Ligand binder design. Structure first.
Ligand SMILES: N=C1N=NC(N)=C1/N=N/c1cccc(C(=O)O)c1
Ligand SMILES: [Co+2]
Ligand SMILES: [Co+2]
Ligand code: NA
Length: 263
């Protein structure tokens, strides 16, 4: 039961996706040693509401208390912005932005490396982004999502890293999470043949160590069981007649927005 967006809906998703990307471009100069994640979230929320005239989709969702998710180092996902949590040299930090504009969602995330990188953090982030990019290059009508998940997993595991099983990409539109699920690993349960006009995210979570995760007592924060680093990147796309179009591209992305597989 996957919805096919009309041309007009796709345009609304271009607008919302651009906004989500622009939050990430806006926040970059503030992501520096010494800043708190609480401050970063306030800057993002003020921007979303006062400048973009949009709404955070995370705020209040299942009771989530903040406007963007900010996850550092061994935190896998859903980290909660906190005025007492300060960024420091060598940290890897995901900021995940999901906004609603004119009824439609845009959803994206990226890693930031704070100050002087660690080589392992830089490698983990790079491989994670590359795994997203290889998946994006596969998207076209007639391909199965299973093939995409399997390919992400093979690539990541060859680097000695692992793919988190509990979270996945998703259909997106008027709802935050819509059909289909987009698993970043191979499953016999996956059988989804892509069609033009489907809109969904790809967003692998990749651990440097083992795949297993743990949720903290705060009921939100997810960490690697082994306290290894974890990284994630996310884009929202639309399937096109000949490939896909990335709706959340930033200037710092190094893949084209429009990917075509025709001659
Ligand atoms: N921020 C997101 N981007 N893609 C997703 N699937 C994201 N999920 N975010 C949240 C945010 C708050 C709560 C939850 C939840 O599952 O309870 C999930
Ligand atoms: Co997201
Ligand atoms: Co998402
Ligand atoms: Na992390």
């Amino acid at each position: 039961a996957i919805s096919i967006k009309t041309p007009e809906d796709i345009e609304k998703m271009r607008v919302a996706g651009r906004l989500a990307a622009e939050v990430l471009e806006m926040i970059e100069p503030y992501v520096k040693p010494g800043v708190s994640t609480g401050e970063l979230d306030r800057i993002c929320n003020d921007y979303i509401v006062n400048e973009q005239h949009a709404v955070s989709a995370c705020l209040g969702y299942h009771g989530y208390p903040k406007s963007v998710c900010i996850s550092i180092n061994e935190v896998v996902c859903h980290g909660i912005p906190d005025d007492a949590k300060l960024l420091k040299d060598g940290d890897i930090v995901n900021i995940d932005v999901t906004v609603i504009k004119d009824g439609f969602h845009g959803d994206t995330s990226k890693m930031f490396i704070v100050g002087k990188p660690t080589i392992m953090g830089e490698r983990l982030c790079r491989i994670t982004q590359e795994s997203l990019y290889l998946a994006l290059r596969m998207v076209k009508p007639g391909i199965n999502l299973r093939e995409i998940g399997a390919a992400i997993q093979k690539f990541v595991e060859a680097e000695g890293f692992s793919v988190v099983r509990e979270y996945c990409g998703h259909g997106i539109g008027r709802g935050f999470h819509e059909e289909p699920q987009v698993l970043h690993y191979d499953s016999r349960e996956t059988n989804v043949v892509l069609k033009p006009g489907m809109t969904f995210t790809i967003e692998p979570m990749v651990n440097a160590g083992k795949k297993e995760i743990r949720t903290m007592k705060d009921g939100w924060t997810v960490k690697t069981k082994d306290r290894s680093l974890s990284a994630q990147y996310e884009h929202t796309i639309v399937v096109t007649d000949n490939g896909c179009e990335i709706l959340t591209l930033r200037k710092d992305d190094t893949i084209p927005a429009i990917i075509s597989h025709d001659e």
